[PDB]
Structures are given as C-alpha cells and as structure tokens.
Design an enzyme around this catalytic site. Structure first.
Site, PDB file in Angstrom:
ATOM      1  CG  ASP G 156      29.496  40.786  37.967  1.00  0.00           C
ATOM      2  OD1 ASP G 156      28.594  41.409  37.305  1.00  0.00           O
ATOM      3  OD2 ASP G 156      29.633  39.526  37.967  1.00  0.00           O
TER       4      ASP G 156
HETATM    5 MG   LIG Z   1      32.296  39.523  38.289  1.00  0.00          MG
END
Ligand SMILES: [Mg+2]
Ligand SMILES: [Mg+2]
Ligand SMILES: [Zn+2]
Ligand SMILES: [Zn+2]
Lengths: 46, 404, 275, 49, 49, 51, 490, 73, 67, 117
Positions: G156
RNA sequence: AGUCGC
C-alpha cells in the site's frame, strides 16, 4: 506608515496611520483588508 | 536507534536499527520487517528513539538489534520471512521453465552481495548460453543451508501421488550443500513457517549472514521482477461460458433442493435430529445445503483457472488472499450471516419489505447468488453490508478487550 | 572497433508537428538511452524567475507563476548562443544568459477579458517569443493560435509582472520537456517473445505488424535479437522536431566525451596506481 | 424586545431565503452552499439529529 | 462510550432506505453515528386535532 | 511508569527495498535536530574538531 | 408517462414534485408503516410477474440505489466491492480536499486545502449529479497501472510520475488564518497592536520582530517562515507599582505577540483588520502555502484504497506504452485480491471506454446493463485489448515487460492528512511544571510517551539500562536529600 | 544566590539573556554557556490537553473566576 | 479552476484547445468528434480536456476582483 | 521540508569527482568504476557496449539507491588485457557509432524532403 | 469536549 487599508467595498484608501477608529470615510464598512508591500518577492516557476 | 510502533503487542514490535540518511520526510524501512511491526505504508506513523550513551548503545546493539530479533521465542519459528510482491516474484522465478541470457545473469549477479565473483556455468550450454532460475537462486542460499520437503502448496497431490514413483511432479523443494536442486519456493519454504529456509539459515550459519541473506534475496528477486512484471486486471476475473453455465446450473440444483426441504417441512413430513429442535434441524439442514453448494462451485472455479492467470499466482504463491477470495470473485459470494445464523427477521417475520412474510428460501434470508464481478442485486447488497458490519464492529470491540 | 554495429537510419514521415522514423542495426540500450535523451537531455528555454508587481486577479500569485512557467518558448534560434545561469560570470541574470518578458494588463471594459501569452512580450529580439503567430502568417490558419490562456479577468482587475526565462533541461523540471509525446516500439510481431500473450488471438496487431499481414499471428524465431526500432517523436512546438533529435545526439556526444575526458583525467592528472 | 435568537442559515428567516443566484453572488455567499446551520461568534455550528 | 459491545452498532434490517447502509465511522463510535439516506426525510410534526 | 521522553521522533513510514533489513532511512530534518553526545578522545579529537 | 411529460414541461411551467404528490401517485412511508407494505423492487419485476412470486404489491421503489447516504453515492459500482471496503471509502471521501465552496477566497476559515486542477470524475453515479459534485470536484483522473515495477510500491504505497506532479498534478494551496484581539481587558493593564522594540518591552524571544509593520502586524505578499512573528501585540502591565523608576529599560510592558508555530512556511495572503463583536480592534491574517505531492502524502481511489506515495520517478523511468502514455500512479497488484475491491478494476475499464469514446460513463450500481462483458466489448471496438491490458515497455532498459500491465483512468483523491504536518522530533524541549517532564503535543513542541506497554517490552528485552535511561535520565532526573535517621525527604 | 534580576553569567556581567524556547535553554549572546532551569512561560505549559479531552477540561486543576473585578476570588 | 496548460500525463500543450472546444459543442455535439477535430487523439490528453470543469466563470461573478 | 533542490540531481559537487576506480580483491584482474551524478541513461548504454566486446568476461552496473545519483560498473577481463582499456575503448567506440548515426540522420533529412528547417 | 488518525 500603514496609511493604506483598501476598504470593505469602496476600495478607497483609509489613511489611518494612527490610533483613530478604523471606519472607512465615505464608505460605511469597517472591515479593512490590508494593501501589499512595495517589497519585491520572487517565485521560481517550478 | 530503536524504532517501534504502537500498540506494542510483543517484543518484536520494538527493535534496533542503524540510521541511513535520505531525502524527503518519512522513515524508510526494509520492506521485510513490515510484518513483525504489523505496519503497512497505507499511512502508518512510527517512532524512533535514539539512545544517549555507550552503555545503552551497546545494550541495544547486542540485545535488541533486528538480525537478532528473527526467530521468535513466541513460537520458535521465524518472526519474518519474505513478504508481499517479492514473495510472488520468487514463486514465479524458481519455476523450472525460467531461462536467462548472459546479460540478465550478469545484471542479477551485480545486485547480489556476497557473490564470490565466479559466474556459474549455465545449465544449458548449447545451442546458446542459458541459466535456469533455481540455479541463480543457489548463489543467494548461504554456505550450505539445507532443507527438505516444504513443498506443501496446492501443487502436486494431497500426498499419495508423489509416492507413485517420484515422477518429480515438479513440486518438492530439495536443497543440498546450499544449492537449490529442484522445485518452486513459496510461503511454505520462505515464509514464517517453522520448517522454513530462513529458519535453517539462522539456525545453521548464525544471525548476521542470515541478515545479509534477507537483504540479498529481496534485492535480486526484485530486479528480475522488473523485467518480468506482474499485474491484475479483469482478465484475471474471467473464466468461460462452460464454467459459468455449470456454476448457474449448480446453484439452480441447490436452490431447488432447498425448496424440497421447505416443502418437506411444511408438509410436516420432516422429523427432528436427536438432541435438537425442528427449527434447528431445518436450519442445520438448509445451512448444510448452501455451504456444500458454495464449496462445490468454488472448487469448480479453482479447476477452471488457467495457469497464466495473475490472480491464481498470488494465491498459490502465498502472497495475499486465499482460495476462498478467488471463489467469491469468480463464482459466488455465498451465504451472509450475523452472530453465526442467517439474517434475522428484523421486520415482522421478514428480512426486507421486498420479500413475502415467512420466506426461508435462500435469497430472502441471507445467501447471495452473484459474484463480485457480476455485482450484487440491491437486496443482496444490503445483506452483504450487514455481514460486513459484523466484521467492522468485532475489530473495535476485540481490540479493547485484548488490550485489557 | 572490429565489433561496432553501424546503425542505419530511415525517415518515414515528417511534419512541422512530429517526426516519425525507424532505426536499424543498433542495440536496444542505444535505442533506449536515445529515447531518455529526447525527454530529459535536450536543453530548452522556459520561464524561471517571476517577479510580480501587482495581482488583483481572482487567482493566487504562485498559481499565476506556475501556469506561466509552462508556456512554450520558440527556441528555434539556437539556445547554444545563450548560456546557463551558473556558468555565466554575471551576477544573477543577464542578456547573454536570460531572456526578459513583461506582462501588463487590466480589465477596464464591461466585458470579461482573457489573458493569453500573446500579451506576454519579449524584451529580447524576436528570436525567442511565445508560440503565437510570431511566425505564422500561416495559410493553414486555425482562426485562433491564442497559444495559451494564462488567466481570466473582470473589470477593475490588474496584473503586472516581469519574468526571466532560462536554458535548462528536462532532467530538472518538466517545463523543460522538449517532447509532447515520444513513441517507441520494436519487434511488433513479438517474434522474440519478449512479451507472452495468453490467448494470443485477443490482441490487436500493431501498425507495423503488417509484415505478417496474415492472421497466423506472431511467428517464433529463437535465434533472433532486437532490431529495427520504431520512433515517433512529437514536439510540443517549443522546438522543431528534427532539431530536437539532432541536438539530442549532440548532447549525448558532449556528455560521453566529457566522461571520457574525466576518465582520462583519472590517469593523466594524479596517475592511477591500479598496477 | 425580549431577546435575540440565532437564525439558521438560508431558512425563510435568513436574508438569503428569497435571493436568486445573482444576488447571492453579489452578497458574497456561494450559491452552492447548502446552508441550514447556525453562525455563532463567527463559527459555523451545526446541530446533530 | 468506550467499553461496551452492543447490538445498537450493527446495521439493523429496518435501515433499508432510511439510513445509509455503509456510512458510519471506523473508530470506536462505529455504527452509533449513522448517516441519513439520500431519499430519507424527516417528519416535522403536526397537531393531531 | 510511562512518561514523555526527549530524543524522540515520529513521521509517516514508506517502503524501501534497497534498504538492508536492520537499516532505517531517516529524513535530514530529524537527523539535524536529533543529537548524540560524544566524548572527546586524544585521537578522534581531530575529527570532532572538524565537526 | 403523462405525469412525466408534465415534469419535462417544468422547464417552463409551474408543475412540480408537489403536484406529483397531489396526483397521489407517490406516498411517504415511515419505518413502522414500511413493515406492513408489500414492496416491489423495480417496475420491471412488478410487470413480468404472473406466477413468478406474488401480485399483492402496494408500493414500489423510485430507485433502489437510493438506499445510499451522501458519501456512499460518490463511490461508483459500490455493489462490485466487498461491503466494508465501501465503508472505508465513505470516510476517506469525506477526508479528501479540492474546492469546498466557490466564494472561498473571502472566507477566513481556520484551515483550508484547495486543489489546483480538480476534475469531474470520468466514471460517475447518477446520484452525483444531485450533489453538485460536477461543480465542486474532489480529485483528479489519474492514468493508473497496477504493476509491481520497482517494488517501491509494496504494502500500500504508490509509485508516481514526478513529471506529472511537476506539470502541476495534484498541486494544492493551503490556508491558515491566525486571529488576534486587542482587549482593553484589565483594570489598568492594556493591550496595543504595535511594533515591539528591545529597548522598551519585556519578552523579546530571539525570533525576528523586524518583519512587523509599524502598525504592529505584517503585510500581504511578504514571505514568512518557522520563526517569524506575524502580529505585534504588547501588554502594558506592571504600570509602576514597583516604586521608584523601574525604568532601567524594558519595564513599561511585556510581550505576548502572536507567531508562527503551525505554518512553518508560506506567504502572507491577506491581512484583515476590523473590529469584532466586543468592539475591540480585531485582526485576522491568512497565509497561503503550497504543498507539492511528495513521498509520504496520502491518496486514495474511490473504492477505499488509501496508500502512501512511496517514491516518485521522472517521466523517463515510468513504464510506457505504444504512444508512450506513461502512468501517473502505479498501485501494487497485491492490493486488490485480498481486499476484493473488484469495482476499482471495472472503473478502469469503464474509465478507458468513456475517456476514449469521449462520453462520460455511468456506474450507478443497480441496472440491467450486464456492464462487465459489454464495457469490454466496446473497448475492443476502439482497438485496445478487449479486457484492458496493454503491453508496457520497461522504462529503464527500454525492454518490453514479459507480461502486460492493466492501465486506464481512475479518479484519485489527495487526502487531508499530509506528511509535512505530522513529522516531529524533540531534542530537549520545554518542561511542564506539574511534572517537570516533557510537553505533550507538538503545539508545545513535546516528546513522545514511552508507555506502560512499551516499558513492558523492554523488560522482555532485559535491556534494563536503557529502560532506566528512558523512564528516568532522558526526561526527568532529580536529586533529593533524605534524612538517614528517618526516611522522610524533608 | 539571591542576586539575579535575570543576571547570572559567571565570566562577564550580563548584557541581556535571550530565550531559546524550542531548545528549552537560556542563552547569553556574546559567549555560550546556558544558565537553564527552563520554563517557556508556565501558562503555555498547562496546555497539556491535546489528544485527551479538553472542552469539559479534565486537566482543569485550576479555575480563574475573573479576580480582577473583585477584591479576591 | 482554469485549464491546466500541458496535459499531466504526457506533456502535450492543451490550454490552447479550450476556447476552441466550447465553440465546437455549440456546433457539433459529438464530443468524440469535437475532441477529434482539436487533434487530441490519445486519451490522457483527451481526459485532460474531457474531464475539466471551468470554475473560473463562476468565480468571476464576485463583485470584488480587487481584494 | 527535506526535498533536495532539483538541480542537485545532475550538477557535480565541488568536493566530488566524476568517476572513481577501485580494485576488487575477490577475483584477480577486475575493477569497480563509480560514476557519480549519472543515471540509467548512461549506465545502461556503457553496459551494452562492453558486453559487445569479446575480451570482457563480465560486465554490469547497479544503481545503489534510487534517491542517490550514482552508478557502479563492475567489469572483468582476461589477464592478457587490462579492463580499463576496454572501458575507454567502449566509450570511444560508442562515440563513433553515435557520430555515424548523426551524420546519416542529417543526410537522411537532407534527402528529398521539404520543410526540413 | 468532540472530531479524527492507525
Ligand atoms: Mg498499507
Ligand atoms: Mg496508514
Ligand atoms: Zn491434511
Ligand atoms: Zn544589468
């Protein structure tokens, strides 16, 4: 001498470089935005 | 310095690191320690403490420093192993079909750390020079670290097939004298599993050379990844006309069979199972039918996946998500449920005003037919949000109680 | 040397807007690095210092400075006469290392005024203006050629400023991109199998794949190597497309020759003791 | 006179309630502002159901 | 507030087209702070007379 | 038993594969603001004098 | 349908929704009453019916996607997403920045973030029209690839096209308004707005008073920074009560002027002087700052995928395709499968077809459009791979990437929470006097808490000297004399 | 040590004593030696409410009651 | 706000096509064709012009262009 | 803020030098060249020109960290031929190919085209 | 206080 102050709407100068009340003459508003410095300031285009 | 995070659930959450100065404004972390901190980079803050004496610097260097926090005493298996994108790239890389020209090998060799400096002889000399994937991997594996087995992915056979004479199949992971002999690497070999390769490096050759081994493996595999690539697109979410007909037809068989159980119940032909009431029996029986339907259809979807598929490569490597996710994406979302049971009659004997009173049939009460790709019908959508809420609330409530 | 692989060029098609061509008998890294040069290393002229006297517009100061920083500059006249700010001896800017512009406008009329680059003017001689009809008494007229739109103004608003453009290149800021677009392609029949099509029939054949005009689709050749690179350099107009390529080749030669001289300087000045 | 009660913004008792797009642009208030919230000592204060 | 698991946090069946299904905070107040549906409206009250 | 401390820092974290496992990359502002107290010896004296 | 023709007529007629209620063709139903109605989902179903289900319906839904609340309607194809995924987006969408009302140039809001070039989304839900979201957009249409490229984007984070942030991508202006009052206040003590001087006032922090105007407050356009004192207030105080001269110097008045401790750089935008409700001379001054998207700033697609900008590369190193349309964001493929946010993927494919056709795309959840196969089919007619992928070349060595990367437009948001505000460090700061331990917030430049739980961890480490250093010698160390004959400190 | 109208520079009689608030130290302009017992205005210091609740003020161990009207609150 | 000079993605100048564009919509409503006549082939340059909202026209109506 | 000034990406620092050469001790006859303030544009091309040379045993380059402008080139040759000479020759050779490419391009433009300037 | 971050 901060003797500028553009007005609330009439935009005329205020000439209040002293202790007197900040009421714009002729124009009723008493909100006084302050005029830019004569100072030069550079911005790189980046 | 020692860096850490909150909440500090366990000793591995706070460890010593060496600073390395960079531009811009955030802490950079070697991707592989993400798991013991349980961080992401989805926006997580971390805090750093700088010790202030030689005695405390000595105490951190000797006791708390990260190559020494590797095998945790929490459950005598490694705390950290290869994660995320690199792990999928290692799976993809060790397959027996990967071959490299003199240029690509030299480039990978150049990224390695302890490389002796002697380019190994390519597994194929003629008609042209070619190095195999496993082979280049053998330069990374320390002095003579040696595992076995740890093949146990969904590749080969639930065990009796390999005994049918060692038709190598192609899935066992055999290494000897620190040289990879055969078979794809994955979560089972490199992961934080008790029997893993990373465990054997630490246990065999000592902590430091293992520390350089994590660094070394992640870097080499990521460069290969750069030429290879990896992605996901709707292409990964699509099967075929034949799978999709069979999926619908199998749901049609399950739904018709539920109506048969309802008719048996209304006719009062049904009898209770011992130790239970008639509703519990009816409910036990319909639940057994809708789950069995779901699993049969999921197993169908697993069967249809082509080997090129990006989606199947992430689950099979053991990077992210599971077999069940593929089911939901490709075949059917499946049953929704709160507190274990099917969606309660929140209205007078109904679930939504859209249904008729007393409709135990699988749709009015829970079970969604569609897949995430097909989209959920309005009612299906709302019942799904009820099932998703249980998951949101439980996270908050459980977090407080364990904390105490 | 007895292994240097010649490099033959061919122009397919050329306009004042783009230049499309094929290179043969060269290496991919050459084909590649030359591409990275068209983007980053061709130098050009763009606004770099903005000093604002007055801003009564409905827009903040840096925002005007920014949009102005991207206005394309006709560097058809050799930027080589004009130096870099750092090498040039003068204090700050100067006529030999800088180009001066002035913009002064105000909306006195009861009609919304548009401020456009034509209002920005070169103090410098007309060999480096904005890309707006300074050269185009073009018979192929597009009843506009307003070049760009700096801001919009209503009655009583004013904008007064001065700006100094410099030579710099794409590696330092995106305003100095000489390229509008830079297409690159090679081995369009995927013969070399550098990419692997699952279900190879779903892909559309490219504009150069025609060689197998046949639907047979991607014949394999295992002994092959990369050859025949296809280019399409498109210019934003701040520089003639042909000139962009030629200056790129020179800049890369100047850059390489400098590395060689630096390396020579390694043994010539303070003799190496590697042996 | 018994006291001063706060007005909810852009309700029929506000000054803004009758004006068109032109008067509101003139008054310096955005035509797209939803209103419906109090202004108290220069702070926008919204009540919660 | 702060230590009490409960069923008035879980989306209830009756919130169909009355209160947005998935627009409640992700923190400890989850599900207690809800957000009105788009078509939802709220009765202003009237004399029964 | 838990108090605020000095010589402490906090930012958002981002991944860096080119980093060793026990290294952490740290911003210039935090490196210049944070300090370590070295003690002067008769030999590293010359380097500290440089600093 | 005749009622519909009056509704079309409303463009020049008095006919309205109230007339529609007056026909008695629509009704209002509260939750208690909604229990007893038999309610058809859609005109389609109420029509086909014969022996399909029932025929006793009494109401019907004006449109089923109306069950969503305000923020949930921004998110396109919400029904192809896993349900909690939709909930994270409803929080984050509310969290993004953009333009928040048009007359914002004259509003003195305490803190605002305005984006430069907001765009209306290429893919939209029909409800979004009723949000005037076409008037006040919250983000930008990125060209996105889901690839792994350099591993910078794992877990992410995202790789970004730095030239795109340079050509002005996701730039923002930020405004903070500082406010100050000249209270008459005390009995004889008095406040004045005026430029202080080290000759005749008490206080005088080493920070620079020279930027103050003779009025006592700075002026627009002057560049300010981390130590600048923006407004010069003074408090005449002692008066003269300490007999004698009490003049030496600096005796007339103390300093308490207002200075930068939150906007550690910027320009003065505006300075506004007026008088407030109390009738005192009052001031507000605004500073505009510009935030370039940088490693650490946080972004999200509309389907609840937030992630940090993990690195930025030049437009040279991005991977590129055919024309060389290099992606602005690359979001990591490992993000999709475990979160099952399949709707994000439909949006690229819907987005690719809309942008390419030139027509804005519908993504309102519940329709009969069978929208996955048919969007794919349009895209093939345009000439791409019928299911979205593209052959992208490696940006470094110019090579072709072995497989294909999935690329196309998606609306993206730059969220409020940005790295430059959070970063923090302390190296011996102020000390609070109830505890003589370090401050708590950054507002007082404080340290961090070495909590009960972090303490416990060091015990498990057996690093006792360091535990002793942190809970003692690093924050609050004190020396006391105790009597030996009795254990009392006194 | 009772003599300190802020004066305490051992080597040379003070000229002025400047407050380096962020570093929490008292500095003497023409040399360099600190004289600390740092307190960057105890009124700023009580503001140890932040992430903790605030506008009911649990940290309110001290009301003000506006004494400058009365004889003494 | 106003139209960004030079499309984010690739670099092609684009502000120059805005005023011409609004004239096309008054003429030929085929947004695809209007975009095509302006020469914005590739879709990133096309989204640039296609998705933009020209907020400045609303902003111009506030009485004071002077503050 | 902590972001470098963008020109610092390519200007050499006043206390630095453009290339640096250090021997490797792991294997005989080998070298490590440090190229400062350079990128893949340069690094990748020099790798390919060296690999073309048949006397070179090994050649490779690696950019040690993306935020840090610098590349390293490892090259190894046969004992009979110094690795330094191969590098110098590899650049000159490359300089020659680009020069011939530039002459052929200008001439190709010179071919019956119009609007060439 | 509340909002909010993970
Ligand atoms: Mg993350
Ligand atoms: Mg996060
Ligand atoms: Zn088993
Ligand atoms: Zn001069």
């Amino acid at each position: 001498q901060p003797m500028i102050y553009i007005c609330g709407e009439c935009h005329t100068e205020n000439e209040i470089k002293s202790r007197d009340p900040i009421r714009c003459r002729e124009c009723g508003y008493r909100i006084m935005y302050k005029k830019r410095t004569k100072r030069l300031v550079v911005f790189d285009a980046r | 310095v020692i860096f850490n995070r909150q909440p500090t659930l366990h000793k591995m959450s706070m460890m010593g690191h060496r600073v390395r100065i960079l531009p811009w404004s955030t802490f950079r972390l070697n991707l592989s320690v993400t798991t013991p901190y349980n961080a992401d980079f989805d926006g997580d803050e971390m805090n750093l403490h700088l010790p202030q004496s030689l005695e405390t610097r000595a105490e951190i260097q000797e006791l708390a420093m990260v190559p020494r926090m590797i095998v945790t005493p929490q459950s005598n298996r490694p705390v950290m192993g290869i994660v995320q994108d690199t792990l999928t790239a290692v799976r993809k890389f060790t397959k027996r079909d990967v071959f490299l020209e003199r240029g690509e090998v030299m480039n990978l060799l150049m990224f390695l750390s302890t490389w002796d400096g002697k380019v190994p002889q390519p597994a194929i000399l003629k008609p042209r020079p070619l190095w195999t994937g496993k082979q280049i991997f053998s330069l990374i594996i320390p002095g003579h670290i040696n595992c076995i087995r740890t093949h146990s992915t969904h590749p080969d056979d639930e065990d009796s097939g390999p005994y049918k004479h060692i038709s190598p199949g192609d899935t066992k992971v055999v290494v000897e004298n620190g040289e990879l002999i055969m078979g794809i690497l994955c979560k089972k070999s490199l992961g934080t599993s008790a029997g893993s390769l990373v465990h054997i490096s630490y246990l065999e050759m000592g902590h430091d050379i293992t520390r350089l081994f994590y660094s070394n493996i992640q870097t080499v595999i990521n460069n290969w990844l750069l030429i290879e690539g990896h992605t996901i697109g709707i292409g990964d979410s699509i099967a075929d006309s034949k799978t999709y007909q069979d999926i619908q037809n199998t749901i049609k068989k399950a739904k018709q069979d539920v109506i048969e159980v309802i008719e048996k119940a209304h006719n009062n032909e049904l009898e209770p199972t011992p130790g239970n009431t008639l509703r519990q029996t009816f409910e036990n029986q319909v639940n057994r039918i809708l789950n069995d339907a779901r699993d049969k259809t999921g197993s169908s979807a697993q069967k249809s996946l082509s080997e090129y598929n990006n989606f199947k490569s992430m689950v099979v490597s053991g990077a992210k998500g599971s077999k069940i996710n593929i089911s939901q994406v490709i075949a059917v979302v499946g049953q929704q449920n709160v507190e274990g049971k099917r969606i309660p009659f929140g209205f007078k004997h109904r679930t939504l005003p859209h249904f008729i009173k007393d409709d135990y049939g699988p749709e009015s009460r829970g079970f969604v037919e569609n897949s995430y790709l097909a989209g959920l019908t309005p009612t299906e959508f709302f019942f799904h949000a009820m099932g998703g809420r249980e998951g949101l609330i439980d996270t908050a409530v459980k977090t407080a109680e364990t904390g105490y | 040397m007895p292994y240097a692989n010649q490099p033959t060029v061919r122009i397919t098609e050329l306009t004042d807007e783009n230049v499309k061509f094929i290179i043969e008998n060269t290496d991919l890294a050459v084909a590649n690095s030359i591409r990275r040069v068209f983007i980053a290393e061709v130098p050009i002229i763009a606004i770099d210092w903005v000093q604002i006297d007055a801003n009564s517009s409905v827009l903040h100061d840096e925002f005007i400075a920014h949009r102005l920083g991207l206005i394309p500059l006709i560097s058809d006249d050799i930027v080589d006469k004009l130096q870099y700010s750092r090498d040039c001896t003068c204090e700050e800017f100067c006529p030999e290392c800088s180009v001066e512009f002035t913009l002064d406008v105000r909306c006195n009329e009861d009609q919304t005024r548009h401020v456009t680059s034509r209002d920005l003017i070169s103090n410098s001689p007309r060999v480096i203006p904005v890309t707006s009809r300074n050269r185009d008494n073009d018979p192929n007229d597009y009843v506009e050629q307003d070049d760009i739109l700096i801001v919009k103004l209503r009655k009583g608003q004013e904008l007064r400023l001065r700006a100094y453009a410099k030579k710099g290149f794409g590696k330092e800021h995106a305003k100095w991109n000489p390229t509008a677009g830079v297409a690159f392609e090679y081995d369009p029949d995927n013969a070399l199998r550098h990419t692997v099509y699952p279900k190879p029939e779903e892909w559309p054949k490219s504009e150069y794949s025609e060689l197998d005009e046949d639907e047979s689709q991607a014949p394999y050749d295992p002994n092959g190597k990369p050859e025949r690179f296809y280019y399409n350099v498109e210019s934003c107009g701040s520089l003639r497309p042909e000139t962009i390529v030629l200056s790129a080749l020179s800049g890369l030669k100047k850059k390489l020759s400098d590395l060689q001289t630096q390396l020579s300087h390694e043994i010539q000045s303070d003799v190496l003791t590697i042996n | 006179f018994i006291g001063k009660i706060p007005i909810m913004l852009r309700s029929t008792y506000c000054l803004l309630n009758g004006l068109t797009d032109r008067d509101l642009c003139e008054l310096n208030e955005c035509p797209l502002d939803p209103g419906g919230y109090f202004i108290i000592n220069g702070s926008e204060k919204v009540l919660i159901a | 507030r702060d230590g009490k698991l409960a069923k008035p946090r879980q989306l209830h069946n009756t919130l169909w087209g009355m209160v947005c299904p998935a627009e409640t905070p992700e923190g400890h107040a989850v599900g207690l702070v809800k957000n009105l549906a788009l078509m939802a409206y709220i009765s202003v009250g009237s004399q029964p007379s | 038993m838990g108090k605020r401390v000095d010589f402490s820092a906090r930012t958002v974290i981002t991944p860096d594969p080119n980093l060793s496992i026990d290294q952490v990359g740290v911003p210039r502002s935090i490196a210049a603001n944070m300090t370590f107290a070295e003690i002067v010896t008769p030999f590293n004296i010359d380097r500290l004098q440089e600093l | 349908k005749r009622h519909i023709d009056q509704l079309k007529e409303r463009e020049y007629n008095n006919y309205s929704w109230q007339d529609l209620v007056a026909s008695g063709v629509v009704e209002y139903i509260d939750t208690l009453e909604e229990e007893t109605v038999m309610l058809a989902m859609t005109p389609d179903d109420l029509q086909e019916k014969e022996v399909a289900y029932c025929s006793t319906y009494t109401h019907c839904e004006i449109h089923p996607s109306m069950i969503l609340g305000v923020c949930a309607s921004i998110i396109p194809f919400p029904d192809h997403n896993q349900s909690p995924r939709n909930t994270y987006q409803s929080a984050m969408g509310k969290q993004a920045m953009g333009v928040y009302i048009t007359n914002f140039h004259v509003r003195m809001d305490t803190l605002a973030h305005v984006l430069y070039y907001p765009q209306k989304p290429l893919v939209t839900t029909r409800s979004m029209e009723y949000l005037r979201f076409r008037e006040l957009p919250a983000g930008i249409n990125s060209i996105v690839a889901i690839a792994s490229y350099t591993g910078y984007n794992q877990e992410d984070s995202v790789i970004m096209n730095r030239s795109a942030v340079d050509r002005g991508f996701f730039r923002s202006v930020f405004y903070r308004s500082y406010k100050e009052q000249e209270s008459k206040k005390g009995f004889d003590q008095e406040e004045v707005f005026e430029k202080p001087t080290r000759e005749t006032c008490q206080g005088m922090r080493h920070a620079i008073y020279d930027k103050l105007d003779d009025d006592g407050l700075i002026a627009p356009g002057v560049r300010v920074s981390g130590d600048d004192v923006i407004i010069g207030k003074t408090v005449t105080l002692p008066e003269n009560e300490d007999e004698l001269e009490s003049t030496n110097r600096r005796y007339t008045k103390r300093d308490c002027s207002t200075f930068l401790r939150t906007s550690e750089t910027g320009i003065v935008d505006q300075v506004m002087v007026t008088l407030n409700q109390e009738g005192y001379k009052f001031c507000k001054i605004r500073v505009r700052s510009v935030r370039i998207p940088q490693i650490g700033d946080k972004f999200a697609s509309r389907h609840g995928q937030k992630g940090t900008c993990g690195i930025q590369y030049r437009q040279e190193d991005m991977p590129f395709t055919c024309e060389g349309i290099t992606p602005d964001i690359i979001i990591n493929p490992h993000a999709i499968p475990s979160r099952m946010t399949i709707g994000h993927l439909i949006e690229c494919l819907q987005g690719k077809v809309s942008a390419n056709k030139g027509e804005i795309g519908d993504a309102t959840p519940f329709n009969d459009a069978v929208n996955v196969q048919k969007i794919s089919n349009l895209l093939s007619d345009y000439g791409y791979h019928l299911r979205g992928n593209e052959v992208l070349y490696n940006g470094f060595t110019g090579r072709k990437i072995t497989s294909q990367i999935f690329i196309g437009p998606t609306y993206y948001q730059r969220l409020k929470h940005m790295v430059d505000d959070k970063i923090h460090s302390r190296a011996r700061g102020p000390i609070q006097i109830l505890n003589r331990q370090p401050m708590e917030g950054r507002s007082r430049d404080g340290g961090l808490r070495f909590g009960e739980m972090e303490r416990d961890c060091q015990i498990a480490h057996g690093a006792a000297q360091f535990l002793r250093e942190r809970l003692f010698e690093a924050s609050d160390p004190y020396q006391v004399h105790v009597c030996n004959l009795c254990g009392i400190m006194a | 040590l009772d003599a300190l109208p802020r004066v305490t520079c051992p080597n040379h009689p003070d000229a002025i004593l400047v407050e380096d608030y962020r570093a929490g130290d008292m500095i003497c302009p023409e040399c360099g030696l600190v004289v600390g017992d740092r307190v960057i205005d105890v009124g700023s210091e009580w503001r140890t409410f932040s992430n903790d609740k605030a506008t009911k003020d649990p940290s309110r161990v001290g009301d003000s009651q506006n004494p400058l009207l009365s004889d003494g609150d | 706000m106003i139209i960004p000079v030079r499309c984010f993605t690739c670099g092609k100048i684009v502000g120059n096509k805005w005023e011409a564009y609004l004239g096309l919509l008054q003429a030929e409503y085929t947004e695809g064709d209007a975009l095509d006549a302006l020469g914005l082939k590739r879709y990133c340059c096309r989204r640039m012009l296609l998705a933009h909202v020209d907020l400045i026209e609303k902003l111009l109506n506030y009485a004071p262009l002077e503050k | 803020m902590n972001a470098p000034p963008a020109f610092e990406s390519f200007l050499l620092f006043e206390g630095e030098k453009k290339i640096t050469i250090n021997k490797d001790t792991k294997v005989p006859n080998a070298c490590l060249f440090t190229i400062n303030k350079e990128d893949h544009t340069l690094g990748n091309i020099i790798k390919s020109q060296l690999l073309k040379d048949p006397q070179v045993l090994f050649a490779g380059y690696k950019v040690p960290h993306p935020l840090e402008h610098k590349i390293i080139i490892r090259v190894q040759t046969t004992p009979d031929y110094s690795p330094q000479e191969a590098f110098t020759n590899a650049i000159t050779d490359l300089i020659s190919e680009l020069s011939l490419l530039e002459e052929r391009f200008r001439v190709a433009i010179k071919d019956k085209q119009e609007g060439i300037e």
